[PDB]
Amino acid sequence: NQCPTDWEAEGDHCYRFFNTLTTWENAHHECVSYSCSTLNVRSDLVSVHSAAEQAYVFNYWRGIDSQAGQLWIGLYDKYNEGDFIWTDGSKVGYTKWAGGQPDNWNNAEDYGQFRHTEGGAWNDNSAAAQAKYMCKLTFE
Amino acid sequence: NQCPTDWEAEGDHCYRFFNTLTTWENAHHECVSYSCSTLNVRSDLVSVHSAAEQAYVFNYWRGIDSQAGQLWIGLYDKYNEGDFIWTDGSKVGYTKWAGGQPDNWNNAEDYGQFRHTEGGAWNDNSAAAQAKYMCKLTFE
C-alpha cells in the first residue's frame, strides 16, 4: 500500500470518499486539486471499469455513509448530449444505468452519480443537484 | 503497487535510483523537488531503517549501476557533529557503518553514503564528493 494517507488502495489506484454534499462541478475541481505533476499523478472524479470496481467504490462509500443520497462520479455528457464519457479520459466500457436512466430530464442532466440503492446504479443529474463524491488517483 | 511511474514499490514506500554523479546537497535538493503537498507526499533522500531496507536499496542500486562508486543517502551531521540524523525527519535506529566510520575525515565529512562494497556499508564523506543517489517517497 503505497497510497497517500486518507486514501484507500485497490489495484493500481487510490480512492478517497468525501462525505460532503456539493455540486458535480465543485466535486470535479476538488478531486482534480489532489493531482501531483512531479509524480505524474492525476487525481479525478472516480471512473468505473468493471463490476468489481463498481462494487469496491459502492462498498467503500456505503461503508462510511449511512445517509440516503447519491455519489458523484466522473461520468458526463456535457460536450455531446447522450454520449457519456469519463473526465479522466479512460474508455467507456462499463455502465450500470438504473432503470429509466439516463433520461436527460428537463434537458439539463449531464452528470453521472451512483444511487445509494441497487449496488450503486447510475443516474444522470443536473448541475444544481448535490451529492457526495469520490476521487481516484491514476499514476500515469 | 500504487507507486508513481518510474518509482519502485517496497513496503509503505516508493524508491527511485538516479544514475548521475552529483554532490550530496544537489542530490538532496533533487529528491525533495519531487515532493507533493497536495497529497502530503514527501520525496527525500533515502532513509534506511532495517537490514531488509538496506538490502533492498543496495540491490536496487547495484542491479542498475555496475560502476565502482557510492550512493548518497539522507544521513548527515551538519547540525550536530557525530549525531547523524535523517533529512526526512525519521529517527535513526538501524546503522551499518563500515569499519572506521564515521570518521569525519579532515574535520570535513558530514554526509552519508553507501559504498558499492560489503552490502553497502556506510561512509561519511564531504560536500565536494560526488556519488549517485536514491530518493524515497514517504506518505505523510
Ligand SMILES: [Ca+2]
Ligand atoms: Ca446536455
Ligand SMILES: [Ca+2]
Ligand atoms: Ca445529458
Ligand SMILES: [Ca+2]
Ligand atoms: Ca436522470
Ligand SMILES: [Ca+2]
Ligand atoms: Ca561537521
Ligand SMILES: [Ca+2]
Ligand atoms: Ca561529520
Ligand SMILES: [Ca+2]
Ligand atoms: Ca569517512
